């Protein structure tokens, strides 16, 4: 979402 990542790549 508004820069948080949940999948690494």
């Amino acid at each position, epitope marked *: *979402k*508004g*820069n*948080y*990542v*949940v*999948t*690494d790549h």
Partner: antibody, heavy 119, light 106 residues
Framework: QVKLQQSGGGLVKPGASLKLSCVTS????????MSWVRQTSDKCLEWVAS????????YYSDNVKGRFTISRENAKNTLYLQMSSLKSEDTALYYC?????????????WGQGTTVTVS | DIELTQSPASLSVATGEKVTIRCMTS??????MNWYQQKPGEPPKFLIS???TLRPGVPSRFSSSGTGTDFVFTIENTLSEDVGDYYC?????????FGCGTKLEI
């Protein structure tokens, strides 16, 4: 079928440390981001920390940054919350939580809850 | 840090009444509003996810609508089984914030 089994709470004195654990089943664990949420004495829910699928990105509330560490071991299907320097303000029911899909930390599956009481 | 203010604080209804619980945000959340229900002494249960979609298995009597800062949760005909606390969550930005709940029927 998805299970999040939690463990590791207790009553501790201020300044103590506790390691909360969450073991999961019924899904490929590395495909999901995971989080810890805590429900305080006034039934308010408060997000504590989140970790990405590989564990390369972690987020914490300003409340716990520097005292709490979220981690996971993908091989064992478990999520941890290492809490240090426990304050009375950290008394809450801590819940292990699963992010519902790839891009969001919004939670679909919640653990049964672990009380940590600092007193 | 996006504040979410859930309203009303509490309500008591008769079964069959319609309820409306609002959740307002300080900033536009791109419709990543999510609704939870916590029945006494159970973990919160996911009712509606981002984009106002009712989750599988949640009954049709629950619905939600909302503009980027103003969202609404509705129960059309309140059944007995619906007492609990309802919470909204924005998952647009970290920190993820929650409203502090609304308790349904006492």
């Amino acid at each position: 079928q998805v299970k999040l089994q939690q463990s590791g709470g207790g009553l501790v004195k201020p300044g103590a440390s506790l390691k909360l654990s969450c073991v999961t089943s019924g899904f490929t664990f590395r495909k999901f981001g995971m989080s810890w949420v805590r429900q305080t004495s006034d039934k308010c829910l408060e997000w504590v920390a989140s970790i990405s699928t590989g564990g390369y990105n972690t987020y914490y509330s300003d409340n716990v940054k520097g005292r709490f560490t979220i981690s996971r071991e993908n091989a064992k299907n478990t999520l941890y919350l290492q809490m240090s320097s426990l304050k009375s303000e950290d008394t809450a029911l801590y819940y292990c939580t699963r992010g519902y899909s790839s891009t969001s930390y919004a939670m679909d599956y919640w653990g049964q809850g672990t009380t940590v009481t600092v007193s | 840090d996006i504040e979410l203010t859930q309203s009303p604080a509490s309500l008591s209804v008769a079964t069959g009444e319609k309820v409306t619980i609002r959740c307002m945000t300080s900033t536009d959340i791109d419709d990543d509003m999510n609704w939870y229900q916590q029945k006494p002494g159970e973990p919160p249960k996911f009712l509606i996810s981002e984009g106002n979609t009712l989750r599988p298995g949640v009954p049709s009597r629950f619905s939600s609508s909302g503009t980027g800062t103003d969202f609404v949760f509705t129960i059309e005909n309140t059944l007995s089984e619906d007492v609990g606390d309802y919470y909204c969550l924005q998952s647009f930005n970290v920190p993820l914030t929650f409203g502090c709940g609304t308790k349904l029927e006492i």
